[PDB]
Design a protein around this nucleic acid. Structure first.
Ligand SMILES: [Ca+2]
Ligand SMILES: [Ca+2]
Ligand SMILES: [Ca+2]
Ligand SMILES: [Ca+2]
Ligand SMILES: [Ca+2]
Lengths: 235, 228
DNA sequence: GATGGTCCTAC
DNA sequence: GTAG
DNA sequence: GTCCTAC
């Protein structure tokens, strides 16, 4: 499925996007070359284009794009009226509170999405210097990170924010694969799962406090962006 | 993978649980006899038990249990404080509104779960009298309903509350299967998707008004139970 | 559409 | 952990 | 069982 010189196309492609990412990107392509069914479809196009020169070039920009800081807007989705009916008549939330409930529920959903995005980026910043590769841009199906281990065996990892982040359908994506999973938070007990992160260097450099600091650094940058934008429109 | 006498064992098993569901249960066991890889594995037991007499008997109780009314408590999960940090610092929710935000978020997630449950039950009420079977108790992997179409072909359907209920990983459960999917609500546009429900009997008989009447009735009933 | 992110219920 |  | 983002 992958072209005979995929590695060379990839190195060339990423040298024209971000040379600092070229070693990492070429390794992801090598993973995919050996494991072609692990290659996710490009969002628009058909499966048959996977492994071509076009796919490799397109992937290089996606790989870089996935590392760009994201500042999403609040959700502007259309609320499901039936949720408010259940809140009111089953959970006895006063009618007067339903509008604020909808807004804060919606904003909380946005926040959760942001937490999962930041979780991946924090982990990548810490473990990539120890040889792990962040598979950014959605190239490797069901995988966030890969590592070539001591015995020249590929390791694959999926990271989730919580012990209940999946359901029976989404979790099945790993069936018949060696992809491991780790999660950050517990839904039904207090604490964090950071010292169970795979690999010793992971455990020693990652922590809940380190993640919170990463999140604060990001929020400070958004406050700076807001201040600058505010001044441009109001001076 | 299913025993030759699957249908007979099914009838007898469901006769000990609820004779009013024996016809429907037997039809599901017939469906799984023709599509044995569609069968979900049982919780206590190994995969190779699927299609045996003990599996059919256990599935009878599960099938009935799946139809029991649920009355979940409010969620009592431990909140992720990072959500409140983002809510306050990113989305500008004032500090003194964070505790209410956390409670209403939790209750809304609970409410959404209930809506999906009632959505399934409403469809089941309306469509089982038109030959469809509500595959209650999760015997058929990734499937909520089955039906034998006009062309004498088994069809299977997954129902979801919303066009964004799935993600790439959960959606992939149907890859390499003929299982169809339908959703109720649109996330980014106004209205509903009810008249896209598969089969003419679905489209003619299911609606948002119908579903609202069903939900109101369901909730007035359990208010009357709490009154009593 | 597809590719990702997210939380809760019962067993 | 696993069926939703 | 559930909702949101980006292409
Ligand atoms: Ca990912
Ligand atoms: Ca992940
Ligand atoms: Ca179901
Ligand atoms: Ca369903
Ligand atoms: Ca949610």
């Amino acid at each position: 499925k992958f072209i005979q010189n995929a590695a060379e196309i990839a190195k060339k492609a990423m040298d024209s996007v971000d040379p600092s990412l070229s070693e990492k990107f070429t390794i992801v392509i090598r993973f995919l070359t050996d494991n072609p069914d692990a290659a996710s479809a490009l969002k628009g196009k058909e499966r048959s284009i996977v492994g071509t020169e076009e796919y490799i070039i397109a992937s290089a920009t996606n790989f870089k794009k996935g590392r760009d800081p994201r500042t999403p807007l609040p959700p502007s989705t259309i609320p499901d009226e039936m949720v408010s009916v259940i809140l009111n008549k089953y959970f006895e939330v006063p009618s007067e509170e339903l509008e604020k409930a909808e807004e804060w529920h919606r904003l909380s959903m946005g926040a959760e999405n942001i937490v999962g995005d930041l979780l991946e980026r924090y982990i990548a910043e810490v473990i990539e210097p120890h040889g792990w590769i962040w598979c950014s841009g959605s190239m490797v199906r069901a995988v966030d990170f890969i590592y070539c281990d001591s015995e020249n065996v590929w390791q694959s990892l999926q990271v989730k924010n919580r012990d209940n982040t999946e359901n029976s359908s989404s979790a099945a994506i790993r069936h018949g694969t060696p992809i491991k999973k780790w999660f950050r938070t517990f839904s039904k007990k207090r604490g964090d799962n950071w010292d169970k992160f795979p690999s010793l260097e992971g455990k020693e450099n990652l922590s809940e406090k380190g993640f919170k600091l990463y999140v604060e650094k990001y929020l400070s940058a958004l406050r700076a962006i807001k201040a600058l934008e505010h001044h441009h429109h109001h001076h």
